[PDB]
Amino acid sequence: YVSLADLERAARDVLPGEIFDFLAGGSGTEASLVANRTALERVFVIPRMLRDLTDVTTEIDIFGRRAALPMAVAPVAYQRLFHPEGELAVARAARDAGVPYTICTLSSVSLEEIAAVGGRPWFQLYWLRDEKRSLDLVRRAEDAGCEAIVFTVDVPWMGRRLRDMRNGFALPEWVTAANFDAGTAAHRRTQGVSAVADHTAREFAPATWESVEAVRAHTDLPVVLKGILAVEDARRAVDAGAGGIVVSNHGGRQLDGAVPGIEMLGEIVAAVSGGCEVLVDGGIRSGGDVLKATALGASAVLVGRPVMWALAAAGQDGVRQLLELLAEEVRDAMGLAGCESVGAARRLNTKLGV
Amino acid sequence: YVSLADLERAARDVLPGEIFDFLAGGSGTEASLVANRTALERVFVIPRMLRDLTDVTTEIDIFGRRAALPMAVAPVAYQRLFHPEGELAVARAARDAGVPYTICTLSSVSLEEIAAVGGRPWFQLYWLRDEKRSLDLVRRAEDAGCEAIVFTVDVPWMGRRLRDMRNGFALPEWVTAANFDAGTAAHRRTQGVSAVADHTAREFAPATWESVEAVRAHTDLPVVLKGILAVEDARRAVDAGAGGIVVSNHGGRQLDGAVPGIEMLGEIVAAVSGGCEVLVDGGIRSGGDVLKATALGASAVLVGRPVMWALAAAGQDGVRQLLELLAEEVRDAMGLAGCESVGAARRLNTKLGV
Amino acid sequence: YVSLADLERAARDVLPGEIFDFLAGGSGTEASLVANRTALERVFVIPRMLRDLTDVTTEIDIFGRRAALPMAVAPVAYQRLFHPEGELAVARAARDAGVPYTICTLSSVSLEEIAAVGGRPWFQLYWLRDEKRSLDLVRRAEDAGCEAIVFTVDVPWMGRRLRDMRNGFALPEWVTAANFDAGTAAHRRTQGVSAVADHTAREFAPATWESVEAVRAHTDLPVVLKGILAVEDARRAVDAGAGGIVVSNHGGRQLDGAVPGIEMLGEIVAAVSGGCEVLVDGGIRSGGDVLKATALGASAVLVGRPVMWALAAAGQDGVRQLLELLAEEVRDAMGLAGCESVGAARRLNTKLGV
Amino acid sequence: YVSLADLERAARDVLPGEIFDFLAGGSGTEASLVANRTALERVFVIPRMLRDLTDVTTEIDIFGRRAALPMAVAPVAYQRLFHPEGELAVARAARDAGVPYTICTLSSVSLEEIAAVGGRPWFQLYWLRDEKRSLDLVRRAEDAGCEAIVFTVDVPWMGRRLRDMRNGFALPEWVTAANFDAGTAAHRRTQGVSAVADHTAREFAPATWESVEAVRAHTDLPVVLKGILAVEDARRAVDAGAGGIVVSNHGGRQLDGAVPGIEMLGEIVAAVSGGCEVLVDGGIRSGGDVLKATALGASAVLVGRPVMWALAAAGQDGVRQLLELLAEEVRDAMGLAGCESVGAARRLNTKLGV
Ligand SMILES: Cc1cc2nc3c(=O)[nH]c(=O)nc-3n(C[C@H](O)[C@H](O)[C@H](O)COP(=O)(O)O)c2cc1C
Ligand SMILES: Cc1cc2nc3c(=O)[nH]c(=O)nc-3n(C[C@H](O)[C@H](O)[C@H](O)COP(=O)(O)O)c2cc1C
Ligand SMILES: Cc1cc2nc3c(=O)[nH]c(=O)nc-3n(C[C@H](O)[C@H](O)[C@H](O)COP(=O)(O)O)c2cc1C
Ligand SMILES: Cc1cc2nc3c(=O)[nH]c(=O)nc-3n(C[C@H](O)[C@H](O)[C@H](O)COP(=O)(O)O)c2cc1C
Ligand SMILES: [F-]
Ligand SMILES: [F-]
Ligand SMILES: [F-]
Ligand SMILES: [F-]
């Protein structure tokens, strides 16, 4: 593979149609899904020349750990959908690459098992109807050695994914939510209905600023709010004691018509003015895209779908190859842009084009 | 049906070509028709997170009544063109959904019959060559329980619809203007001529500000001016005593090259500064589009063509399904955007994209 | 015919390929040709409502005569290329429609014959290597009753039209420059060479501000400079005593990459501040386009290619039908936009869209 | 040939696939390659009229020599890839046309042989791992009569060209770096690897501002820094004693996502404020494009790929024809825009369009 696009092709070949659709799709007309890509394509970097490149390093320090790249694996539920080794394959590859891996509330292998892989993992939290269950997950994650809580704040319920509805998508019997008894709703086949959306509408409670404070009081770990797009919500996240935010429209899967995170990133970085880490996701598909995000001010990016393409295509080895490719592309882009460090990349200027 | 687009497909299947064209088409090169869609597609919402969503309500109060959604059925003439039950089917579904229905001057079932369905209806007025006839329609509408007069101000005569001209479109014998003897002109088949345009050029008189005052003096009902695009005309509408305006280019069917209402809406909302209700129409095709209109400042939207798609596809039941779908999409979009009420949605910010 | 586009289709059917190409084409990559259309398509009108339309008039006064529309037939050389009656057919139709007709220096019927048709014609001037010949043409035009001199200032030589070069285009033996002995160069067939471009490079001299003064001193008629795009050249035209200018890139046939006139029009109208008439051409293809040009501040437009489509399709009758269609579309657009006069249309606002 | 596009067609016919790809391609997704063209297409010239054109001259003085056009042949490595006469054919044609030719560090014929052709050549420098070798090349170039050193500053290593990787591109045995023993790395065939990229990663050292000073101290010739895009790097180039810069993203072959030079040119010209020559390259494909670059403030342009198309198509004669065509297109564009000199063209204004 010489690009991430090679991997999407490989994944489409192997995965069952309804599973590829569940992975690829967005909500509504998929306007926000497409806009994530369009928004990146419009950004051009103004590279610097003639700088010392004798020791280019792509490393960052974030949430108390050194990471090999300004990148982490995004939370993606139910990874056994894509390969039998699911989360274990991805976590092993991430560990070996020095990249943080985000363990999901709806992981198909238990959070303790995935944490046991090592690699100083993060944990993604959904707020559940039973608050105590969500707080218990936080404590389990901390006890297991997770280093940050990524609280997803953009899913009071799941968006309307028309591909999943048309397919009457449901989880196969062999894929379950391993962290708790989530019941059978996500496995029920109903015509024109997404079982996964039906399941979560029952299981999830809308999170509020009060929920954030409950989590912050329950752990010493940095709390990172994922799904922030409004400048005022980014400011409030800092005031609330968040250690970071992920500027994100959830891959175009939640509100159709939500602005891409990449379009809000610069304004958000200015408003928080170093008060927390500011990550971004949505459509990152190359090292050059990582560079663009960094130049707009991101601390790091998350990558979601491409990691699943790699997992579907070739399991752990596939994810390894994807991360090695991304690492090479990041080093390449940084050097060509005159940046010996990620901090230097954050000081690059950009220009919008057509 | 999982989207309004499903309904257009269904309607194209069933309707005769020239009737689908009469419904779908616009004037001239259809630039304004396309621009209504383009304009919405360029608007992105900046959603808010972490707000209380324990009682999301899509209701509004408008013209003295509670409506279930910030939406009404737009005036569409001659609904028997699309289904034998015509206006009665649509009005029944609107009533059951709690959505205002606009009864047309050129309805194919009498305004009194449609009003008898219930649901607190509005009445759309065209200014006719005989002024007394137009004022009599206003009084009939009020006597029948209509709750607002929607005075269409953008049709001094009908625009040039090339599809209708090429088709030599005329009304079938079984469709007539039930509110008065409109003569036979709209039924006459002439090559390269639209009988409907020929008919109205004879029957309609251009309305003026004097006509608005005559209507305002003739009724206690709120007068709503439909087809306002200039900021100064919106201001003047308030000064003239209008209870509302509909910012609209008449679905791209009148002046080809007229700006979309959605492009003028924000400026108009600022200029009237709460002095009347400001509605918008043109290309609303989802709950997310309703959200965009609200975020730009609209009090409510009108929906035209999709209601006729639903009527053509499955009669009253079709319209019911369309309104249930729109209601779900509106609730979904509002919640995902952090809005427990339509007032909160009006306070959302937006960003233009490409 | 219900649109001008109908006529282009008709003309492509009948004309020989190389003649249609000579008519349709532009210079270079045809960027400016396409941009003339793109530029109009991006302009949207903000129409006014509720104004008195009891006597809509499309008439203007220009260069001392009343014209039926804010439009004239653009100068187009060698009209016998398109129909045997050539300029006489077009001039007769223009006269009957009350539209000024521009007689060309390179007309294929003598200027005196075309003037004898009546209709108070204009005369287009090219500056020739022998200055006395150009001034003699001016005097002939004035003696024959022409009412303005349209001095083309954007053809120091002909642009590079790749269609004409590839076709090895040359005039047929039966088409000649009837106003003087122009020699045989335009009739010579040479591979990969445009004989018309070769001919004019020999015959034409670049015009200068001194040439303008020589013309202004030679006639009492208003001198109109055609092909102005720079604001400073428009100002200078007023200072030089021009009665008008035509803001124009010569239909995309001269400098490839020249800005469309419609893009410079507003700025030019502001800069001249009523000091001369400001016309525009390039891509006017409907009454709505006329309205857009007027709203941007034009006194009138010229129309070129569509008049030749009509002439090729059906001779004098074809041109008559085209002008009747344009007249109807102009009246329609004006009324729908709330304008009872062309002066009111000039006060309309516009908005750029995508 | 009537346009440069004719030549690309001819070249695609004759060249082996992997060689055409090596020539045509860019790095990554080829975003910057495409953007070079898009950026030029968006620029429109505002031409002037009525100026004296009795002696239009396309000549410039640059680096102490008169050039026939505001254009030079860009450095393109390994010209024997495209025709057996390689650099000698191109240099002879450039000499005969009065256009500077840039001899490459990686020329496939020795720099002394190419210089012996005459025509007052420039020399392009890459900084090599052995600094002394690079400085020796500078001295060789000066001794051989080269008139400027074009120091390429945007290749600390070669970008990721996916076409070359997929093709497993390597130089044929009959093409070598004639200026020094470059070893065998560029000739080694490895699957999924570009031998040329592998070769240069070993051979090249990243250049720094210290390298620029070492070169400036080693020669009396003007040093021109090629690959500057940041305004601050252009300013620093002047402060460093550069005689010129080439504003360039290396034809979209280095950082994918680098802004086009044409997008930075105006800002760069303003910032240097006459302190050095400012050239631009990337996508120049006509005399009209030369005019656009000049109007944005460039001293001259470089042309790369089209010169190789011409060389592949017809050797020395092909390059001659290309330069004659470009010369004619430049003269044509300048005159149509009212410019009797390149200095006048630099004073033209431009407007962005869509
Ligand atoms: C199949 C799938 C499952 C996901 N599951 C979660 C989840 O459980 N929690 C969460 O916060 N985000 C989830 N996401 C969103 C991603 O974390 C990420 O925001 C999104 O995929 C956009 O990045 P991308 O374009 O790189 O895919 C999921 C995305 C996909 C495609
Ligand atoms: C078939 C048809 C008939 C219409 N009849 C009327 C009418 O009688 N009065 C009126 O004010 N608008 C009329 N309209 C315009 C609509 O009320 C509305 O402004 C327009 O359809 C744009 O909304 P849409 O894109 O949702 O269709 C009609 C529209 C259509 C398509
Ligand atoms: C075939 C042809 C011949 C023309 N001949 C002349 C001419 O002799 N003098 C002149 O000033 N313009 C001439 N023009 C330019 C037109 O007057 C006008 O500026 C141009 O066609 C743009 O308008 P359009 O898009 O309506 O065609 C010619 C254009 C065409 C297509
Ligand atoms: C095949 C090829 C080889 C090149 N070799 C060099 C080189 O050795 N040194 C250099 O500075 N630029 C090199 N370039 C870049 C060109 O000098 C120029 O910047 C680029 O081709 C953009 O111009 P264009 O669009 O006219 O091709 C090369 C470009 C190509 C296509
Ligand atoms: F999830
Ligand atoms: F109607
Ligand atoms: F001509
Ligand atoms: F190279």
Side-chain angles (χ1 to χ4, degrees):
Chain A
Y1 313 110
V2 295
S3 72
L4 271 58
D6 283 346
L7 291 159
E8 183 184 28
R9 294 187 268 276
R12 196 188 272 101
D13 284 340
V14 62
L15 292 171
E18 67 164 3
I19 291 187
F20 187 85
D21 278 341
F22 168 69
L23 174 64
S27 60
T29 68
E30 299 186 344
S32 288
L33 173 63
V34 171
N36 286 348
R37 284 301 305 162
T38 301
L40 276 162
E41 291 170 352
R42 287 189 325 125
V43 176
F44 290 79
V45 171
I46 305 171
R48 298 300 296 264
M49 305 296 155
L50 297 167
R51 307 170 120 193
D52 188 3
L53 295 176
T54 49
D55 297 306
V56 175
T57 169
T58 63
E59 298 186 335
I60 66 165
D61 293 304
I62 192 167
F63 309 135
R65 74 166 274 182
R66 186 75 61 92
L69 290 170
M71 155 201 287
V73 176
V76 169
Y78 300 126
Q79 291 171 23
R80 276 178 40 72
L81 282 172
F82 313 111
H83 188 279
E85 295 179 354
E87 290 83 357
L88 291 183
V90 187
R92 288 166 178 148
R95 168 200 65 198
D96 289 351
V99 173
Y101 174 80
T102 310
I103 300 170
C104 290
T105 284
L106 295 175
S107 58
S108 55
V109 175
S110 79
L111 70 92
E112 286 85 4
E113 286 168 80
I114 303 164
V117 162
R120 317 169 63 177
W122 298 347
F123 179 74
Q124 175 273 340
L125 180 68
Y126 277 132
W127 202 243
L128 307 169
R129 298 248 176 245
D130 171 48
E131 159 164 356
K132 289 178 288 188
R133 177 176 272 159
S134 53
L135 294 179
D136 186 52
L137 291 170
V138 170
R139 179 60 51 78
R140 283 171 63 186
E142 187 168 4
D143 285 345
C146 292
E147 305 201 326
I149 304 299
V150 179
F151 192 178
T152 302
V153 302
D154 60 4
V155 188
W157 51 77
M158 287 186 52
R160 293 180 53 89
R161 296 105 187 262
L162 306 188
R163 304 191 201 196
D164 294 345
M165 293 181 181
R166 290 170 169 141
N167 288 335
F169 181 73
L171 298 174
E173 147 270 333
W174 61 85
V175 173
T176 68
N179 294 326
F180 56 94
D181 181 10
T184 69
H187 288 85
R188 185 172 315 121
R189 292 278 187 182
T190 298
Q191 253 189 51
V193 161
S194 171
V196 147
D198 175 68
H199 173 248
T200 51
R202 314 165 170 271
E203 295 294 285
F204 290 5
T208 66
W209 292 107
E210 287 196 37
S211 318
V212 173
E213 176 52 26
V215 173
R216 195 212 51 81
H218 202 67
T219 184
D220 288 320
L221 297 179
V223 177
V224 179
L225 307 186
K226 170 171 187 290
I228 299 291
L229 291 168
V231 176
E232 307 75 14
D233 286 345
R235 292 195 191 93
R236 186 156 179 185
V238 181
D239 292 331
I245 59 180
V246 188
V247 181
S248 172
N249 67 12
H250 209 107
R253 298 163 68 85
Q254 287 297 102
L255 174 69
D256 187 41
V259 66
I262 204 68
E263 291 279 346
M264 300 303 302
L265 176 60
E267 189 169 2
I268 283 170
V269 167
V272 301
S273 190
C276 67
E277 303 285 356
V278 180
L279 295 82
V280 68
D281 72 14
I284 299 297
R285 299 295 180 261
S286 70
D289 292 342
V290 177
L291 188 70
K292 286 172 179 190
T294 307
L296 292 168
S299 302
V301 302
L302 314 179
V303 180
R305 292 172 184 98
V307 180
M308 301 304 106
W309 301 338
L311 172 66
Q316 185 185 333
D317 187 59
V319 180
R320 176 192 66 82
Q321 287 180 63
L322 169 72
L323 299 173
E324 288 180 353
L325 173 58
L326 282 174
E328 179 54 21
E329 288 177 351
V330 172
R331 185 198 96 80
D332 178 62
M334 285 179 58
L336 295 177
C339 295
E340 202 184 33
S341 68
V342 173
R346 290 186 69 259
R347 296 187 302 271
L348 291 168
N349 294 128
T350 55
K351 196 162 190 292
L352 302 188
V354 290
Chain B
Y1 313 110
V2 295
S3 72
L4 271 58
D6 283 346
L7 291 159
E8 183 184 28
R9 294 187 268 276
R12 196 188 272 101
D13 284 340
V14 62
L15 292 171
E18 67 164 3
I19 291 187
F20 187 85
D21 278 341
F22 168 69
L23 174 64
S27 60
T29 68
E30 299 186 344
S32 288
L33 173 63
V34 171
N36 286 348
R37 284 301 305 162
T38 301
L40 276 162
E41 291 170 352
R42 287 189 325 125
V43 176
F44 290 79
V45 171
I46 305 171
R48 298 300 296 264
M49 305 296 155
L50 297 167
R51 307 170 120 193
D52 188 3
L53 295 176
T54 49
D55 297 306
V56 175
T57 169
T58 63
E59 298 186 335
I60 66 165
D61 293 304
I62 192 167
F63 309 135
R65 74 166 274 182
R66 186 75 61 92
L69 290 170
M71 155 201 287
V73 176
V76 169
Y78 300 126
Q79 291 171 23
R80 276 178 40 72
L81 282 172
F82 313 111
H83 188 279
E85 295 179 354
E87 290 83 357
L88 291 183
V90 187
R92 288 166 178 148
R95 168 200 65 198
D96 289 351
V99 173
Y101 174 80
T102 310
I103 300 170
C104 290
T105 284
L106 295 175
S107 58
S108 55
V109 175
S110 79
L111 70 92
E112 286 85 4
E113 286 168 80
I114 303 164
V117 162
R120 317 169 63 177
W122 298 347
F123 179 74
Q124 175 273 340
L125 180 68
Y126 277 132
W127 202 243
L128 307 169
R129 298 248 176 245
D130 171 48
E131 159 164 356
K132 289 178 288 188
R133 177 176 272 159
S134 53
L135 294 179
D136 186 52
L137 291 170
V138 170
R139 179 60 51 78
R140 283 171 63 186
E142 187 168 4
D143 285 345
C146 292
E147 305 201 326
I149 304 299
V150 179
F151 192 178
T152 302
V153 302
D154 60 4
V155 188
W157 51 77
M158 287 186 52
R160 293 180 53 89
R161 296 105 187 262
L162 306 188
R163 304 191 201 196
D164 294 345
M165 293 181 181
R166 290 170 169 141
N167 288 335
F169 181 73
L171 298 174
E173 147 270 333
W174 61 85
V175 173
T176 68
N179 294 326
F180 56 94
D181 181 10
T184 69
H187 288 85
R188 185 172 315 121
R189 292 278 187 182
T190 298
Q191 253 189 51
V193 161
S194 171
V196 147
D198 175 68
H199 173 248
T200 51
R202 314 165 170 271
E203 295 294 285
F204 290 5
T208 66
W209 292 107
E210 287 196 37
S211 318
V212 173
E213 176 52 26
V215 173
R216 195 212 51 81
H218 202 67
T219 184
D220 288 320
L221 297 179
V223 177
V224 179
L225 307 186
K226 170 171 187 290
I228 299 291
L229 291 168
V231 176
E232 307 75 14
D233 286 345
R235 292 195 191 93
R236 186 156 179 185
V238 181
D239 292 331
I245 59 180
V246 188
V247 181
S248 172
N249 67 12
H250 209 107
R253 298 163 68 85
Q254 287 297 102
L255 174 69
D256 187 41
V259 66
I262 204 68
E263 291 279 346
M264 300 303 302
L265 176 60
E267 189 169 2
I268 283 170
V269 167
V272 301
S273 190
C276 67
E277 303 285 356
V278 180
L279 295 82
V280 68
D281 72 14
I284 299 297
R285 299 295 180 261
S286 70
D289 292 342
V290 177
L291 188 70
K292 286 172 179 190
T294 307
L296 292 168
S299 302
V301 302
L302 314 179
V303 180
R305 292 172 184 98
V307 180
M308 301 304 106
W309 301 338
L311 172 66
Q316 185 185 333
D317 187 59
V319 180
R320 176 192 66 82
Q321 287 180 63
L322 169 72
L323 299 173
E324 288 180 353
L325 173 58
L326 282 174
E328 179 54 21
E329 288 177 351
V330 172
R331 185 198 96 80
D332 178 62
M334 285 179 58
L336 295 177
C339 295
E340 202 184 33
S341 68
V342 173
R346 290 186 69 259
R347 296 187 302 271
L348 291 168
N349 294 128
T350 55
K351 196 162 190 292
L352 302 188
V354 290
Chain C
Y1 313 110
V2 295
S3 72
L4 271 58
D6 283 346
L7 291 159
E8 183 184 28
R9 294 187 268 276
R12 196 188 272 101
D13 284 340
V14 62
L15 292 171
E18 67 164 3
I19 291 187
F20 187 85
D21 278 341
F22 168 69
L23 174 64
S27 60
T29 68
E30 299 186 344
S32 288
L33 173 63
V34 171
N36 286 348
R37 284 301 305 162
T38 301
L40 276 162
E41 291 170 352
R42 287 189 325 125
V43 176
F44 290 79
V45 171
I46 305 171
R48 298 300 296 264
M49 305 296 155
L50 297 167
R51 307 170 120 193
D52 188 3
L53 295 176
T54 49
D55 297 306
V56 175
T57 169
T58 63
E59 298 186 335
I60 66 165
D61 293 304
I62 192 167
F63 309 135
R65 74 166 274 182
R66 186 75 61 92
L69 290 170
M71 155 201 287
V73 176
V76 169
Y78 300 126
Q79 291 171 23
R80 276 178 40 72
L81 282 172
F82 313 111
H83 188 279
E85 295 179 354
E87 290 83 357
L88 291 183
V90 187
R92 288 166 178 148
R95 168 200 65 198
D96 289 351
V99 173
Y101 174 80
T102 310
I103 300 170
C104 290
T105 284
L106 295 175
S107 58
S108 55
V109 175
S110 79
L111 70 92
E112 286 85 4
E113 286 168 80
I114 303 164
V117 162
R120 317 169 63 177
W122 298 347
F123 179 74
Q124 175 273 340
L125 180 68
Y126 277 132
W127 202 243
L128 307 169
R129 298 248 176 245
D130 171 48
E131 159 164 356
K132 289 178 288 188
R133 177 176 272 159
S134 53
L135 294 179
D136 186 52
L137 291 170
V138 170
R139 179 60 51 78
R140 283 171 63 186
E142 187 168 4
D143 285 345
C146 292
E147 305 201 326
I149 304 299
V150 179
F151 192 178
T152 302
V153 302
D154 60 4
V155 188
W157 51 77
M158 287 186 52
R160 293 180 53 89
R161 296 105 187 262
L162 306 188
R163 304 191 201 196
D164 294 345
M165 293 181 181
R166 290 170 169 141
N167 288 335
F169 181 73
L171 298 174
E173 147 270 333
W174 61 85
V175 173
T176 68
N179 294 326
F180 56 94
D181 181 10
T184 69
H187 288 85
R188 185 172 315 121
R189 292 278 187 182
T190 298
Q191 253 189 51
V193 161
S194 171
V196 147
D198 175 68
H199 173 248
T200 51
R202 314 165 170 271
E203 295 294 285
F204 290 5
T208 66
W209 292 107
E210 287 196 37
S211 318
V212 173
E213 176 52 26
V215 173
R216 195 212 51 81
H218 202 67
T219 184
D220 288 320
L221 297 179
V223 177
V224 179
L225 307 186
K226 170 171 187 290
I228 299 291
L229 291 168
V231 176
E232 307 75 14
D233 286 345
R235 292 195 191 93
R236 186 156 179 185
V238 181
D239 292 331
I245 59 180
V246 188
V247 181
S248 172
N249 67 12
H250 209 107
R253 298 163 68 85
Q254 287 297 102
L255 174 69
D256 187 41
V259 66
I262 204 68
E263 291 279 346
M264 300 303 302
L265 176 60
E267 189 169 2
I268 283 170
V269 167
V272 301
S273 190
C276 67
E277 303 285 356
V278 180
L279 295 82
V280 68
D281 72 14
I284 299 297
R285 299 295 180 261
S286 70
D289 292 342
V290 177
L291 188 70
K292 286 172 179 190
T294 307
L296 292 168
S299 302
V301 302
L302 314 179
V303 180
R305 292 172 184 98
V307 180
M308 301 304 106
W309 301 338
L311 172 66
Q316 185 185 333
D317 187 59
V319 180
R320 176 192 66 82
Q321 287 180 63
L322 169 72
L323 299 173
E324 288 180 353
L325 173 58
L326 282 174
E328 179 54 21
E329 288 177 351
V330 172
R331 185 198 96 80
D332 178 62
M334 285 179 58
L336 295 177
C339 295
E340 202 184 33
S341 68
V342 173
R346 290 186 69 259
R347 296 187 302 271
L348 291 168
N349 294 128
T350 55
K351 196 162 190 292
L352 302 188
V354 290
Chain D
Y1 313 110
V2 295
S3 72
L4 271 58
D6 283 346
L7 291 159
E8 183 184 28
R9 294 187 268 276
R12 196 188 272 101
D13 284 340
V14 62
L15 292 171
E18 67 164 3
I19 291 187
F20 187 85
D21 278 341
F22 168 69
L23 174 64
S27 60
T29 68
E30 299 186 344
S32 288
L33 173 63
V34 171
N36 286 348
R37 284 301 305 162
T38 301
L40 276 162
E41 291 170 352
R42 287 189 325 125
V43 176
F44 290 79
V45 171
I46 305 171
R48 298 300 296 264
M49 305 296 155
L50 297 167
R51 307 170 120 193
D52 188 3
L53 295 176
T54 49
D55 297 306
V56 175
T57 169
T58 63
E59 298 186 335
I60 66 165
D61 293 304
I62 192 167
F63 309 135
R65 74 166 274 182
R66 186 75 61 92
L69 290 170
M71 155 201 287
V73 176
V76 169
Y78 300 126
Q79 291 171 23
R80 276 178 40 72
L81 282 172
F82 313 111
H83 188 279
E85 295 179 354
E87 290 83 357
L88 291 183
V90 187
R92 288 166 178 148
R95 168 200 65 198
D96 289 351
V99 173
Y101 174 80
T102 310
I103 300 170
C104 290
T105 284
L106 295 175
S107 58
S108 55
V109 175
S110 79
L111 70 92
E112 286 85 4
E113 286 168 80
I114 303 164
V117 162
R120 317 169 63 177
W122 298 347
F123 179 74
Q124 175 273 340
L125 180 68
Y126 277 132
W127 202 243
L128 307 169
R129 298 248 176 245
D130 171 48
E131 159 164 356
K132 289 178 288 188
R133 177 176 272 159
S134 53
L135 294 179
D136 186 52
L137 291 170
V138 170
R139 179 60 51 78
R140 283 171 63 186
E142 187 168 4
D143 285 345
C146 292
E147 305 201 326
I149 304 299
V150 179
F151 192 178
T152 302
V153 302
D154 60 4
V155 188
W157 51 77
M158 287 186 52
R160 293 180 53 89
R161 296 105 187 262
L162 306 188
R163 304 191 201 196
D164 294 345
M165 293 181 181
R166 290 170 169 141
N167 288 335
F169 181 73
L171 298 174
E173 147 270 333
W174 61 85
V175 173
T176 68
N179 294 326
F180 56 94
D181 181 10
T184 69
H187 288 85
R188 185 172 315 121
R189 292 278 187 182
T190 298
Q191 253 189 51
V193 161
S194 171
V196 147
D198 175 68
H199 173 248
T200 51
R202 314 165 170 271
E203 295 294 285
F204 290 5
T208 66
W209 292 107
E210 287 196 37
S211 318
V212 173
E213 176 52 26
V215 173
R216 195 212 51 81
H218 202 67
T219 184
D220 288 320
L221 297 179
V223 177
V224 179
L225 307 186
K226 170 171 187 290
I228 299 291
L229 291 168
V231 176
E232 307 75 14
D233 286 345
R235 292 195 191 93
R236 186 156 179 185
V238 181
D239 292 331
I245 59 180
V246 188
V247 181
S248 172
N249 67 12
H250 209 107
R253 298 163 68 85
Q254 287 297 102
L255 174 69
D256 187 41
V259 66
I262 204 68
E263 291 279 346
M264 300 303 302
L265 176 60
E267 189 169 2
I268 283 170
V269 167
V272 301
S273 190
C276 67
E277 303 285 356
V278 180
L279 295 82
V280 68
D281 72 14
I284 299 297
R285 299 295 180 261
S286 70
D289 292 342
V290 177
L291 188 70
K292 286 172 179 190
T294 307
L296 292 168
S299 302
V301 302
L302 314 179
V303 180
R305 292 172 184 98
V307 180
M308 301 304 106
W309 301 338
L311 172 66
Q316 185 185 333
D317 187 59
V319 180
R320 176 192 66 82
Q321 287 180 63
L322 169 72
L323 299 173
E324 288 180 353
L325 173 58
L326 282 174
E328 179 54 21
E329 288 177 351
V330 172
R331 185 198 96 80
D332 178 62
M334 285 179 58
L336 295 177
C339 295
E340 202 184 33
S341 68
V342 173
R346 290 186 69 259
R347 296 187 302 271
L348 291 168
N349 294 128
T350 55
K351 196 162 190 292
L352 302 188
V354 290

